[PDB]
Design a protein around this ligand. Sequence first.
Ligand SMILES: C[C@H]1C(=O)N(C)C=C(c2cnn(C)c2)c2cc([C@@H](O)CO)ccc21
Length: 112
Amino acid sequence: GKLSEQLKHCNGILKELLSKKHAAYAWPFYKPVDASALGLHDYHDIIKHPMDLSTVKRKMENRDYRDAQEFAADVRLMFSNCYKYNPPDHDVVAMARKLQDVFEFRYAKMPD
Ligand SMILES: C[C@H]1C(=O)N(C)C=C(c2cnn(C)c2)c2cc([C@@H](O)CO)ccc21
């Protein structure tokens, strides 16, 4: 079906974002930000809705996403959190930009 086919494309994108091909810049986004471990004691005051690729993967596996739009909103929320918390000249923001380019260009190839 339409939703199934579009969610197959989303699952393909998710696998690519987690693949060794993109590991050099994807690694900050693999797991939830551990604010306490990183000494970022303001992270949860600034970021109300944390998101990361392991959470997107669990939601995809649990059939939480009913359509491609819901999946894309979570992937974009993950990048937006990075752009909100970190100064724009920081290394992690450059890595976010690169992984979001991978995401946006392949998401744009969504089947109709
Ligand atoms: C605030 C935080 C963030 O937005 N993200 C997405 C996650 C990390 C992070 C750190 N450890 N892990 C396992 C992930 C991260 C990494 C760096 C630098 O170390 C990048 O070089 C800087 C800032 C962050």
